[PDB]
Amino acid sequence: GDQRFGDLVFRQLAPNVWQHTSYLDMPGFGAVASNGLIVRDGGRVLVVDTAWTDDQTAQILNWIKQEINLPVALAVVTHAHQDKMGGMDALHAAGIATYANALSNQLAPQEGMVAAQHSLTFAANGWVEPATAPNFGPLKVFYPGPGHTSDNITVGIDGTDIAFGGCLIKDSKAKSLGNLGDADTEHYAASARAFGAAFPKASMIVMSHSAPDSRAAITHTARMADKLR
Ligand SMILES: C[C@@H](O)[C@@H](C(=O)O)[C@H]1C[C@H](SCCNC=N)C(C(=O)O)=N1
Ligand SMILES: [Zn+2]
Ligand SMILES: [Zn+2]
């Protein structure tokens, strides 16, 4: 049930939730997929993560216009890497309010990214401070601790079986944890398990670079990270 729209792919995961997928050719290595989410919440649409580029992210907004036909109220991006924040200009051009971890926004210029318009901050237990995430509807944002990057955050979709681990979680068939260039290998395992504990009701785990998996993806990722300590 994958729908193609331009160079992007869209898959419905639940009555009010879709996965968006965009690709970037990396020289010598080929096209890399990156996933994010689109959530219908009453009379508005919420987006998790941009596509790799501005042009691709504009196509997400175009797809939303056609298939859902409701205004995009806000977007949350899960850390300061190109696959998650590469298309920020397309959102700001459309007047969509954007949110990121304060640390992601602090890092964005160093990473060549455009910072989100707004900053999220987090309690010592990892849950977002409600004052920084107003009107997020079903999006429950959790900072699990450093892992894939120092700033990585995760999102559960309230009222569904779905939680989004971003680039922190790999699927149960994954060989490696991928890019460890920016990673915290000491705390990764604990951060992956913290994401699992934060969303115990989630049975469908969506991640950046694999099709949705079961909760086994969290545990398998944690046990791979265990060996990096
Ligand atoms: C380019 C960056 O956005 C990078 C990142 O988020 O750090 C992307 C691409 C690699 S894909 C490598 C996975 N390899 C699997 N065989 C990756 C990942 O492994 O999570 N994320
Ligand atoms: Zn990343
Ligand atoms: Zn990634």
Author numbering: 42 to 270
The authors write:
Zn1 is ligated to three histidine residues, H120, H122, and H189, while Zn2 is coordinated with D124, C208, and H250. To address whether carbapenems undergo pyrroline tautomerization during hydrolysis and whether diverse protonation mechanisms exist for different β-lactams, we conduct a combined investigation on NDM-1-catalyzed hydrolysis of imipenem and meropenem using X-ray crystallography and NMR spectrometry.
Although both tautomers showed convergent conformations, our structures revealed two divergent modes of imipenem-zinc binding. In four imipenem- and all five meropenem-bound structures determined in this study, the carbapenem intermediates present in either Δ2 (EI1) or Δ1 (EI2) bind the dinuclear metal center in a consensus manner with hydrolyzed penicillins or cephalosporins revealed in NDM-1 strucutures. However, in the remaining two structures containing Δ1 imipenem, one oxygen atom of the C6-carboxylate (C7O) intercalates between the two Zn(II) ions, giving rise to hexahedral coordination of Zn2 with a significantly decreased C7O–Zn2 distance, from 3.2 to 2.5 Å (averaged for all imipenem copies). The imipenem molecules in these two structures show an evident shift forward to Zn2 by ~0.5 Å with respect to their counterparts in EI2, albeit remaining an almost identical overall conformation. As a result of this translational shift, the C3-carboxylate moves farther away from Zn2, markedly increasing the C3O–Zn2 distance to 3.3 Å, essentially beyond a canonical ligand-metal interacting range. In comparison with other imipenem-bound structures, the antibiotic molecules modeled in these two structures have significantly lower overall occupancy than the imipenem counterparts in other structures (0.74 vs. 0.89) and display higher flexibility in the R2 side chain. Considering the weakened imipenem–metal interaction and lower refined occupancy, we suppose that the species revealed in these two structures more likely represent an EP derivative in which a protonated product has been generated and is ready to be released from the active site.
